[PDB]
């Protein structure tokens, strides 16, 4: 398929593990919003979207409930064919050229994720970091796999060591990807 | 590893030349196997794998389900695109261009720009550098900004990095020296 | 407030 702009007005995801679900809209590969299925709230990912765009989270909850039904049927129809664990590839880089003292952001891209059950954390000098760690939703791909991006806002210093730990069922061990300056 | 059963429903819209060519494709995916899809160019549900004959034949029989999915070309694809014209298609983030010696290799770090259309050229002394210039594919930061790094093998002269972008009527010209 | 909609999903046979 060829097009100038591709829009995913309905990236509906539901998996038996959890069970967890996800509803989100994407345009040109960027997540417009996701719907927090637990709080029934639409979370737009740009300030311009929050002031001009609106979406009812009840439409998302209804589709996911249909996905829960549809999943139970294709499980029975496919003789309970479980998913295949893929090997995710991890890339770490900065958003802007790092300047000491100027706050930047580290970007941990975890690509080729399937099933959408990944556990991504940051480490500073070997210590787990639980501050400034943001995370995107599972962003769809054309081959029906997913990729997730984790962020880490930091302050550049001389003795800084940052690694992105990624834990997935397709990996034999937790994958540590060090960030080379 | 625990077993997992994944289900995906992708309601995808395709646009070309503004609103002249609009296409709707709703994909139904078990794990990573798309078994049924509805193509607005076709107009009816069709099974992609032998896992969706029961679904495609049944959804095509429900008259209102088929007609509403057909009407989603106007209620979803065409309607939401008008809101994109007010917001997404007007987003213009100017790129930040920085030249810095690598740690000889000069890099031209073009970061935080939108949309994806960009052009970067290296110039050694008003003569364009073809060989020795190594670029990266466009990088999606995930926060509606893109990034690209164009390196140049050099040996010292005023090296110049030119950048073009829709947000810029004037191309950004940065000299290293 | 007016909201945009996504693609509607159908219920399988079952």
């Amino acid at each position, epitope marked *: 398929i060829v097009a100038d702009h591709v829009a995913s007005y309905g990236v509906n995801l539901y998996q038996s593990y959890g069970p967890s679900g996800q509803y989100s809209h994407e345009f040109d590969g960027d997540e417009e919003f996701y719907v927090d299925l637990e709080r029934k709230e639409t979370v737009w990912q740009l300030p311009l979207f929050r002031r001009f765009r609106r979406f*009812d989270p009840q439409f998302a909850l*209804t589709n996911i409930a249909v996905l829960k039904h549809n999943l139970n049927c294709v499980i029975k129809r496919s003789n309970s064919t479980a998913a295949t664990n893929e090997v995710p590839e991890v890339t770490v880089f900065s958003k802007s050229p790092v300047t000491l003292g100027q706050p930047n952001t580290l970007i941990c891209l975890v690509d080729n994720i399937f099933p959408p059950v990944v556990n991504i954390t940051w480490l500073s000098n070997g210590h787990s970091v639980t501050e400034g760690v943001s995370e995107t939703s599972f962003l769809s791909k054309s081959d029906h796999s997913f990729f997730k991006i984790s962020y880490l806002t930091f302050l550049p210093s001389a003795d800084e060591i940052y690694d992105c730990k990624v834990e997935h069922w397709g990996l034999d061990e937790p994958l540590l990807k060090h960030w080379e300056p | 590893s625990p077993e997992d059963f994944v289900y995906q429903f992708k309601g995808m819209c395709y646009f070309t030349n503004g609103t002249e060519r609009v296409r709707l494709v709703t994909r139904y995916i078990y794990n990573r196997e798309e078994y049924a899809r509805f193509d607005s160019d076709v107009g009816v549900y069709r099974a992609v794998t032998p896992l969706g004959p029961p679904a495609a034949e049944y959804w095509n029989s429900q008259k*209102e*389900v088929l007609e*509403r999915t057909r009407a989603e070309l106007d209620t979803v694809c065409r309607h939401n695109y008008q809101l994109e014209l007010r917001t997404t298609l007007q987003r213009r983030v100017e790129p930040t261009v920085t030249i810095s010696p690598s740690r000889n290799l000069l890099v031209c770090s073009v970061t935080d720009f939108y949309p994806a259309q960009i052009k970067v050229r290296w110039f050694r002394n008003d003569q364009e550098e073809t060989t020795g210039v190594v670029s990266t594919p466009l990088i999606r930061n995930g926060d509606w900004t893109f990034q690209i790094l164009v390196m140049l093998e050099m040996t010292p002269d005023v090296y110049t990095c030119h950048v073009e972008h829709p947000s810029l009527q004037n191309p950004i010209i940065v000299e290293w020296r | 407030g007016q*909201v945009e*909609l996504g693609g*509607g999903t159908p*219920i399988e046979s079952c």
Partner: T-cell receptor
Amino acid sequence: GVTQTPRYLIKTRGQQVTLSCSPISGHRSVSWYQQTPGQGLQFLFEYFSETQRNKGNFPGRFSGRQFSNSRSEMNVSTLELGDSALYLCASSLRRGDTIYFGEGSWLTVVE
Amino acid sequence: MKTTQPPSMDCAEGRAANLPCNHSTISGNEYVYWYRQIHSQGPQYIIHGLKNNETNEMASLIITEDRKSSTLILPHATLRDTAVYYCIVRVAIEGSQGNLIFGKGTKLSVKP
């Protein structure tokens, strides 16, 4: 067709009333409405996949449930004289399709 | 609501009843629905459409090109067609996405 039971009810102030509704065979979305001569036909709540979706502007006294067979049961607590009305139930194949109403349950709250 | 209707409208038996309805604030993702209620019975679904003209065995729906107004055309008016006709826009609004909020409607009296 949509079926509603009971067809007529007489209750006093303070009591509670449960209203049943069997939707059209195959339908899974159920909506409840209240019709009064005063405020007209007002929306109460909508149910799909055993959970409530869209909800009207009625107090917590007006509750409801939806079972696995897509059947719904509306309940009203601490009945007032203004609660006497015709309570209509509508069903659709799914949330977002054409809703089809039943005949309703006539409730009359007496002093 | 988004719909405005004539409160009452008379019609002679056998003639065609053209029930008007205005909805200039409708959106591209909202349908026009028509319902009727005979006496204190359950509301009967008539027809619905988006932008084209629809026709079932009961009536015909004519929506303007700019979708700002519509008309329900009952060709063969019987005495059993004396009812309150509700023109409803199924809105796409937060808190009421997909709700059919009834208005005052049009009281159509088929005069024999």
